[PDB]
Amino acid sequence: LVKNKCVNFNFNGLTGTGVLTESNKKFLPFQQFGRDIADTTDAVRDPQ
Amino acid sequence: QKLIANQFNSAIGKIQDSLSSTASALGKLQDVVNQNAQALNTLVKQLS
Numbered sequence A: 001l002v003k004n005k006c007v008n009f010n011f012n013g014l015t016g017t018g019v020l021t022e023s024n025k026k027f028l029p030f031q032q033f034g035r036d037i038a039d040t041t042d043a044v045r046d047p048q
Numbered sequence B: 001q002k003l004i005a006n007q008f009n010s011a012i013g014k015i016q017d018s019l020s021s022t023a024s025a026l027g028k029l030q031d032v033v034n035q036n037a038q039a040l041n042t043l044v045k046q047l048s
């Protein structure tokens, strides 16, 4: 996994292109995606 | 003059309060900002 650097990605069927970083948003344990007010994917969880 | 000064000074004071509490006066400006940020959503949803 690479951070702070524009990359392409696929996470467990989530497909998208973006700039991954570390975050502070406490995701729900049983959750998977974060999202945003326009519904566009705003975060993820690294299953490994 | 004096009386006219006080009536003016005090009358300024209300404008703080009238703004400080009641949130309706700015509806206009508050309306423009919405409808712009409104349409963008309604614009972006279309991508779904």
Ligand SMILES: *[C@@H]1O[C@H](CO)[C@@H](O)[C@H](O)[C@H]1NC(C)=O
Residues within 6 Å of the ligand: A047, A048
């Ligand atoms: C991934 O592997 C490491 C060591 O191989 C392990 O400690 C870690 O728990 C693994 N991740 C998960 C989600 O099990």
